[PDB]
Design a protein around this motif. Structure first.
Motif, PDB file in Angstrom:
ATOM      1  N   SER A  45      -9.825  18.890   6.938  1.00 45.66           N
ATOM      2  CA  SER A  45      -9.228  17.952   5.997  1.00 45.66           C
ATOM      3  C   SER A  45      -8.651  16.742   6.724  1.00 45.66           C
ATOM      4  O   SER A  45      -8.224  16.862   7.868  1.00 45.66           O
ATOM      5  CB  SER A  45      -8.143  18.622   5.211  1.00 45.66           C
ATOM      6  OG  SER A  45      -8.614  19.782   4.543  1.00 45.66           O
ATOM      7  N   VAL A  46      -8.593  15.592   6.030  1.00 46.05           N
ATOM      8  CA  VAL A  46      -8.022  14.347   6.542  1.00 46.05           C
ATOM      9  C   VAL A  46      -7.309  13.563   5.435  1.00 46.05           C
ATOM     10  O   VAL A  46      -7.604  13.721   4.249  1.00 46.05           O
ATOM     11  CB  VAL A  46      -9.087  13.442   7.189  1.00 46.05           C
ATOM     12  CG1 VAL A  46      -9.633  14.010   8.476  1.00 46.05           C
ATOM     13  CG2 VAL A  46     -10.215  13.058   6.238  1.00 46.05           C
ATOM     14  N   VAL A  47      -6.421  12.648   5.860  1.00 48.71           N
ATOM     15  CA  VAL A  47      -5.846  11.598   5.027  1.00 48.71           C
ATOM     16  C   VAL A  47      -6.429  10.244   5.442  1.00 48.71           C
ATOM     17  O   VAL A  47      -6.355   9.893   6.616  1.00 48.71           O
ATOM     18  CB  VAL A  47      -4.313  11.568   5.169  1.00 48.71           C
ATOM     19  CG1 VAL A  47      -3.678  10.593   4.187  1.00 48.71           C
ATOM     20  CG2 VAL A  47      -3.694  12.948   5.036  1.00 48.71           C
ATOM     21  N   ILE A  48      -6.942   9.459   4.476  1.00 50.32           N
ATOM     22  CA  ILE A  48      -7.549   8.153   4.707  1.00 50.32           C
ATOM     23  C   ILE A  48      -6.618   7.078   4.131  1.00 50.32           C
ATOM     24  O   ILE A  48      -6.220   7.194   2.982  1.00 50.32           O
ATOM     25  CB  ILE A  48      -8.950   8.137   4.056  1.00 50.32           C
ATOM     26  CG1 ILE A  48      -9.854   9.277   4.541  1.00 50.32           C
ATOM     27  CG2 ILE A  48      -9.628   6.783   4.225  1.00 50.32           C
ATOM     28  CD1 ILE A  48     -11.018   9.572   3.613  1.00 50.32           C
ATOM     29  N   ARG A  49      -6.305   5.994   4.876  1.00 47.83           N
ATOM     30  CA  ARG A  49      -5.099   5.213   4.612  1.00 47.83           C
ATOM     31  C   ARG A  49      -5.270   3.950   3.767  1.00 47.83           C
ATOM     32  O   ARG A  49      -4.260   3.500   3.226  1.00 47.83           O
ATOM     33  CB  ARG A  49      -4.324   4.824   5.873  1.00 47.83           C
ATOM     34  CG  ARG A  49      -2.898   4.388   5.555  1.00 47.83           C
ATOM     35  CD  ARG A  49      -2.035   4.009   6.730  1.00 47.83           C
ATOM     36  NE  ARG A  49      -2.571   2.889   7.482  1.00 47.83           N
ATOM     37  CZ  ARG A  49      -2.386   1.619   7.164  1.00 47.83           C
ATOM     38  NH1 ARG A  49      -1.668   1.289   6.104  1.00 47.83           N
ATOM     39  NH2 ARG A  49      -2.909   0.674   7.922  1.00 47.83           N
ATOM     40  N   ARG A  50      -6.455   3.323   3.678  1.00 47.56           N
ATOM     41  CA  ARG A  50      -6.593   2.156   2.800  1.00 47.56           C
ATOM     42  C   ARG A  50      -7.848   2.308   1.945  1.00 47.56           C
ATOM     43  O   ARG A  50      -8.936   2.523   2.475  1.00 47.56           O
ATOM     44  CB  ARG A  50      -6.657   0.838   3.579  1.00 47.56           C
ATOM     45  CG  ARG A  50      -5.415   0.532   4.404  1.00 47.56           C
ATOM     46  CD  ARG A  50      -5.301  -0.911   4.881  1.00 47.56           C
ATOM     47  NE  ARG A  50      -6.391  -1.238   5.779  1.00 47.56           N
ATOM     48  CZ  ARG A  50      -7.258  -2.234   5.640  1.00 47.56           C
ATOM     49  NH1 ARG A  50      -7.178  -3.100   4.644  1.00 47.56           N
ATOM     50  NH2 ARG A  50      -8.223  -2.368   6.526  1.00 47.56           N
ATOM     51  N   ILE A  51      -7.690   2.205   0.623  1.00 41.68           N
ATOM     52  CA  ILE A  51      -8.731   2.593  -0.320  1.00 41.68           C
ATOM     53  C   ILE A  51      -8.985   1.433  -1.284  1.00 41.68           C
ATOM     54  O   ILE A  51      -8.052   0.749  -1.700  1.00 41.68           O
ATOM     55  CB  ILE A  51      -8.311   3.903  -1.035  1.00 41.68           C
ATOM     56  CG1 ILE A  51      -8.089   5.094  -0.089  1.00 41.68           C
ATOM     57  CG2 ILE A  51      -9.223   4.260  -2.203  1.00 41.68           C
ATOM     58  CD1 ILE A  51      -9.320   5.602   0.638  1.00 41.68           C
ATOM     59  N   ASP A  65       0.583   5.271  -4.227  1.00 46.31           N
ATOM     60  CA  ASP A  65       1.771   4.988  -3.427  1.00 46.31           C
ATOM     61  C   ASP A  65       2.333   3.575  -3.640  1.00 46.31           C
ATOM     62  O   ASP A  65       3.325   3.225  -3.014  1.00 46.31           O
ATOM     63  CB  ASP A  65       1.490   5.223  -1.936  1.00 46.31           C
ATOM     64  CG  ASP A  65       0.402   4.344  -1.319  1.00 46.31           C
ATOM     65  OD1 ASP A  65      -0.251   3.549  -2.056  1.00 46.31           O
ATOM     66  OD2 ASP A  65       0.192   4.469  -0.089  1.00 46.31           O
ATOM     67  N   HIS A  66       1.701   2.765  -4.495  1.00 48.75           N
ATOM     68  CA  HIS A  66       2.026   1.355  -4.687  1.00 48.75           C
ATOM     69  C   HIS A  66       1.862   0.500  -3.420  1.00 48.75           C
ATOM     70  O   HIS A  66       2.426  -0.583  -3.326  1.00 48.75           O
ATOM     71  CB  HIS A  66       3.441   1.181  -5.255  1.00 48.75           C
ATOM     72  CG  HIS A  66       3.734   1.922  -6.510  1.00 48.75           C
ATOM     73  ND1 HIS A  66       3.168   1.594  -7.718  1.00 48.75           N
ATOM     74  CD2 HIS A  66       4.586   2.933  -6.750  1.00 48.75           C
ATOM     75  CE1 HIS A  66       3.635   2.400  -8.647  1.00 48.75           C
ATOM     76  NE2 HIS A  66       4.506   3.231  -8.076  1.00 48.75           N
ATOM     77  N   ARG A  67       1.144   0.982  -2.418  1.00 47.10           N
ATOM     78  CA  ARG A  67       0.968   0.202  -1.220  1.00 47.10           C
ATOM     79  C   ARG A  67      -0.506   0.357  -0.914  1.00 47.10           C
ATOM     80  O   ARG A  67      -0.888   1.281  -0.200  1.00 47.10           O
ATOM     81  CB  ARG A  67       1.753   0.850  -0.069  1.00 47.10           C
ATOM     82  CG  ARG A  67       3.251   1.068  -0.249  1.00 47.10           C
ATOM     83  CD  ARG A  67       4.061  -0.200  -0.202  1.00 47.10           C
ATOM     84  NE  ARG A  67       5.444   0.167   0.046  1.00 47.10           N
ATOM     85  CZ  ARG A  67       6.311   0.484  -0.901  1.00 47.10           C
ATOM     86  NH1 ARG A  67       5.937   0.476  -2.167  1.00 47.10           N
ATOM     87  NH2 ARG A  67       7.550   0.809  -0.576  1.00 47.10           N
ATOM     88  N   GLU A  68      -1.363  -0.462  -1.509  1.00 43.41           N
ATOM     89  CA  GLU A  68      -2.788  -0.180  -1.344  1.00 43.41           C
ATOM     90  C   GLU A  68      -3.054   1.183  -1.989  1.00 43.41           C
ATOM     91  O   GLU A  68      -2.601   1.398  -3.114  1.00 43.41           O
ATOM     92  CB  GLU A  68      -3.245  -0.365   0.107  1.00 43.41           C
ATOM     93  CG  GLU A  68      -2.950  -1.778   0.603  1.00 43.41           C
ATOM     94  CD  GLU A  68      -3.358  -2.176   2.011  1.00 43.41           C
ATOM     95  OE1 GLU A  68      -4.248  -3.045   2.134  1.00 43.41           O
ATOM     96  OE2 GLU A  68      -2.753  -1.660   2.977  1.00 43.41           O
ATOM     97  N   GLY A  69      -3.695   2.117  -1.283  1.00 42.89           N
ATOM     98  CA  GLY A  69      -3.749   3.495  -1.766  1.00 42.89           C
ATOM     99  C   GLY A  69      -4.203   4.442  -0.664  1.00 42.89           C
ATOM    100  O   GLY A  69      -4.605   3.955   0.385  1.00 42.89           O
ATOM    101  N   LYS A  70      -4.124   5.765  -0.881  1.00 43.53           N
ATOM    102  CA  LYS A  70      -4.607   6.706   0.125  1.00 43.53           C
ATOM    103  C   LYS A  70      -5.208   7.955  -0.512  1.00 43.53           C
ATOM    104  O   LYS A  70      -4.874   8.277  -1.635  1.00 43.53           O
ATOM    105  CB  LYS A  70      -3.554   7.019   1.192  1.00 43.53           C
ATOM    106  CG  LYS A  70      -2.231   7.594   0.723  1.00 43.53           C
ATOM    107  CD  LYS A  70      -1.393   8.042   1.899  1.00 43.53           C
ATOM    108  CE  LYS A  70      -0.792   6.898   2.695  1.00 43.53           C
ATOM    109  NZ  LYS A  70       0.399   6.333   2.020  1.00 43.53           N
ATOM    110  N   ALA A  71      -6.108   8.639   0.202  1.00 46.69           N
ATOM    111  CA  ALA A  71      -6.802   9.807  -0.323  1.00 46.69           C
ATOM    112  C   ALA A  71      -6.707  10.981   0.651  1.00 46.69           C
ATOM    113  O   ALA A  71      -6.625  10.773   1.864  1.00 46.69           O
ATOM    114  CB  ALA A  71      -8.247   9.441  -0.582  1.00 46.69           C
TER     115      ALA A  71
END
Ligand SMILES: [Zn+2]
Lengths: 140, 128, 101, 142
Positions: free
Chosen positions: B22-28, B53-59
């Motif tokens: 699994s991973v977290v990806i930071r700008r979507i 997150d109201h800051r760009e987004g993440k997945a």
RNA sequence: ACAGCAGCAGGCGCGAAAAUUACCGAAGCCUCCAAGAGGGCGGUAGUGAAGAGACGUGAAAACAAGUGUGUGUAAAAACCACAUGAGUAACUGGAGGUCAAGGCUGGUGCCAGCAUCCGCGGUAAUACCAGCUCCAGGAGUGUCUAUGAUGAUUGCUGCGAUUAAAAGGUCCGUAGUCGAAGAACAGUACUUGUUUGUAAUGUGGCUUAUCGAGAGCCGAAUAGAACGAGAAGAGUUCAGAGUAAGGAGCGAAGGAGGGCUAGAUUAUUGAGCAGCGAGAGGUGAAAUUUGAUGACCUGCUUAGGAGUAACAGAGGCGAAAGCGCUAGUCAAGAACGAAUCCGAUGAUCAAGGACGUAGGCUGGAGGAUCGAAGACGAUUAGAGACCGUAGUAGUUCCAGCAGUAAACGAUGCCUACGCUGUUGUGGUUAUGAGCACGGCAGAAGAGAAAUCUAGUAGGGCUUUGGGGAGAGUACGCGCGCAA
RNA sequence: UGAGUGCAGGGUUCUAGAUCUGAUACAAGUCGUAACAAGGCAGCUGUAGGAGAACCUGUAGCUGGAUCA
């Protein structure tokens, strides 16, 4: 230069790069028509003016038999090589000879002969190979 | 700034090599969502959550054992239906499996659906 | 080919450093590269302390010491044998030398 | 990274997730709106208005109560300045550097800082004279 | 007076380079007042190993090319039919490796020659000159010259830039190329339908000349244009939205960052005076040299011009070049803490502009130490050099010009994704840790290795290399007082 | 409307030239020995003088050094 609308920049750059290739450069920017045999003609007619000999490059040890030719089409005088075993004996002063290239990419010296760039092909309208091997005779 | 669809690909490729699940990806972005949703339809990834997150987004995503590689193409070339098989033969390992993804007036579709729908588009990315 | 990772000197995150002069030949050498040697030498030799004990007017006496820091360029340090040539694996070992007297 | 130098600092302050209404406070809406317009007429910059509201009157980010932003309120009240406050602070620093160099002409470091400062002015000017916030033929005070 | 073959034959030249001063009431077409007349337009043959098909040079019983009739045509020749004779018919390049096929026999001895490249031959040559056997293609085979491929050695797909050739000395900056999240909107690019748009050639086919090229008929087609359709990406707008995007501002603090003003402990030289009475200096060893006009060394006075030892480091600061005594003063910047403000203001950069150790140049101030040039003493075959004595321009400051360095971590700038342990510097801390800037040691991957600023990758933008030499040289041009 | 032709200039490409000065090849000639070993004064880059000739000397820099200390 890899953008989708960058074609103009890319084209102009890549064209300028090609001048680094010796081949493209000579065709574009050198004197390609200076030579008796080359871009201009496959063979050249000329008149024999002097008989000559030259040493081979090291480490070989020989005297190579050569001829001074005045070229009808340019009025330059050039050195040519005479190929066969007894070949020098088939040529007189003031004979007409046809002359040919040595087969390199540019006009370049071949084997151990320094600075000679052509060879004799025919003497007085007949094949030198036939003259030397006594298959045919001088026109007389 | 880096391209968001490029960033997505390197993030999952490296984590897969390091044998993480699994991973977290930071700008979507919008097409990043649609790309991930494509990999889920063909069973290359298993679970998707999106963080608002109201800051760009993440997945956050779960990887399957079936994914060998994925990648984005830049720039996004325009292609006629006549052209797509050329790109298919360049990118994919075999004629039998793998997916080349194309954007069209009918959303994201794969190189087989292009034949079914009779449409070219713009080249986006691939996975196998 | 590159022989040492640190280019033979201790400069990092700087442009330029002060120079110093070699004790043996007065050549200029950068401070961060020069071979350094420390000395603490008694004013009076060991072979005289037994005479000092009968010569002095005081009840007890402590001999004065003299202190020095010396600098050497590469050529001088090698020639005077402060340093020596070493094998490709030994080159990496770093240890503080003794103070001389 | 930074625009004129090699900096990569990260000091910022977090914006809240939701804003609510500051019920712990000890003034009404109308009082807070009066406090702002007073501080404005006395000549304070709008960034300082924000600092005072947080520090003294106890309101974070100065919007949860008003449903409106500070500069928009000043335009509604008619208290708008002649030059935007950012462009204004750049002209001030230029003047200061020119006043130093006028008496200490030898300083190459200050010369260096001036050309950086001046570049930043015109880059900001070109923004505002596209959004019609300055007259087209505006020029620096120099 | 006449005349103009880039019409058809033909001649001369020029070249390495190209056919007959031939027949034609027939075929395809054109021209006239025509049940007819004209046409070197066109057709028919002759000549030539430019290209392309099909077949001869024997079989085991039994084989082209000849000839005569008929056909064929405008008239012909060739072609085809039947009938007669018969027994003819291979050369070019090679045989050491690449590269298929002989250490065979005789000549020659670094000669004569051969060899694209590598290489053979100095009397025992499978490589020269020949004989004899083999090999390869075969009515054909060798050579020269342009070009396409070979070649990822021009790189869109798809190469390189630590050390092989290759990242601009550092910044600013225009043209150019490239540019958030959220909610909505519109159709010109974009993709696609229908209809147009291709004789020959080429492409997919079928049919007839003994066969095979050939001939005849069919079907679809590129780019380009006309009218509709779809809206993902791209584009335009908005603000009850506020980037580990940028700029403005607040709070406490840190640093050899810079300019200016006023001071400082020693040291090296020079002069004055006093004491003493013979050597000092310099080297591996010595000589130039200096001393009874008192050196050297030790006191006290003074005069100048440079510099900041030890502390002091794989420490700090600056865009780089670079920056180290103490106080006071003047501007701006970096980082950190946090519920401050504005809202796309941004990345990289031809042209254009500003800085740039040292040495050099133009003018002023000054001149302690050191020292290019120049002059001596030694050493040597010779030293013009290295060593010693001495000595000038420079070395310092102010106002400018210039524009180069192994200006190097020989590693461009933004922005990502990435294992562990240890040690620093400055702030902050639930005291568990973080953020910015570093050093070190392994690992895994990578790479020709050495090693790792070099791991992963179609992210954006600029510079730049293409076998050695000649050459960073010539000519032209731009800057500079010159160099 | 203008062919031709006067007289000055330019723009291109070739070619002559007393004499001077580069480069390349010189089987092996003359004088030294500058580089490669601490190559007998460690080498190299910039700049400025000097010198039969390689080169030598001052000043700042670099290790690709003979030192990761
Ligand atoms: Zn020394």
């Amino acid at each position: 230069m890899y953008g989708l609308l960058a074609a103009r920049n890319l084209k102009k750059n890549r064209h300028k790069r090609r001048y680094a290739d010796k081949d493209f450069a000579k065709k574009a920017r050198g004197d390609i028509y200076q030579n008796a045999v080359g871009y201009s003609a496959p063979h050249a007619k000329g008149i024999v003016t002097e008989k000559l000999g030259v040493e081979a490059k090291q480490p070989n040890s020989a005297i190579r038999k050569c001829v001074r030719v005045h070229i009808v089409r340019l009025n330059k005088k050039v050195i040519a090589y005479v190929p066969h075993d007894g070949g020098l004996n088939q040529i007189e002063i003031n004979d007409e000879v046809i002359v040919e290239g040595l087969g390199k990419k540019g006009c370049r010296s071949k084997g151990d002969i320094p600075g000679v760039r052509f060879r004799v092909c025919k003497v007085q309208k007949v094949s030198l190979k036939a003259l030397v091997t006594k298959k045919k005779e001088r026109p007389a | 700034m880096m391209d968001k669809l490029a960033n997505l690909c390197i993030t999952i490729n490296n984590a897969n090599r390091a044998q993480k699940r699994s991973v977290v990806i930071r700008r979507i972005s919008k097409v990043c969502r649609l790309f991930l949703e494509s990999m889920q339809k063909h069973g290359y990834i298993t679970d998707i959550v999106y963080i608002d997150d109201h800051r760009e987004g993440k997945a956050v995503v779960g990887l399957s054992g079936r994914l060998n590689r994925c990648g984005a193409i830049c720039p996004r070339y325009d292609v006629e239906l006549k052209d797509v098989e050329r790109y298919r033969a360049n990118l994919l390992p075999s004629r039998g499996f793998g997916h080349l993804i194309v954007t069209s007036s009918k959303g994201l579709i794969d190189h087989r659906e292009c034949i079914q729908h009779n449409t070219g588009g713009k080249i986006l990315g691939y996975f196998y | 080919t590159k022989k040492r990772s640190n280019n033979g000197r201790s400069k990092k995150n700087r442009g330029h450093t002060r120079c110093v002069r070699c004790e043996h030949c007065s050549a200029m050498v950068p401070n961060d590269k020069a071979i350094k040697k420390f000395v603490v030498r008694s004013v009076i030799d060991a072979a005289s302390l037994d005479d000092l004990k009968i010569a002095t007017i005081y009840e007890e006496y402590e001999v004065p010491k003299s202190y020095y820091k010396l600098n050497y360029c590469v050529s001088c340090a090698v020639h005077i044998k402060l340093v020596r040539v070493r094998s490709r694996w030994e080159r990496k070992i770093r240890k503080e030398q003794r103070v001389s007297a | 990274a930074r625009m004129y130098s090699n900096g990569k600092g990260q000091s910022k302050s977090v914006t809240p997730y939701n804003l609510t209404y500051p019920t712990y406070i000890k003034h009404s809406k109308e009082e807070i709106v009066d406090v702002i317009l007073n501080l404005a007429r006395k000549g304070t910059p709008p960034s300082q208005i924000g600092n005072i509201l947080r520090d003294n009157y106890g309101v974070g980010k100065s919007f949860a109560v008003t449903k409106t932003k500070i500069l928009t309120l000043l335009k509604i009240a008619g208290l708008k300045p002649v030059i935007p406050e950012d462009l204004n602070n750049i002209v001030k620093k230029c003047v200061n550097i020119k006043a130093h160099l006028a008496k200490y002409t030898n300083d190459k470091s200050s010369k260096y800082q001036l050309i950086q400062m001046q570049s930043c002015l015109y880059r900001v000017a070109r923004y505002y004279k596209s959004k019609n916030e300055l007259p087209a033929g505006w020029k620096p005070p120099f």
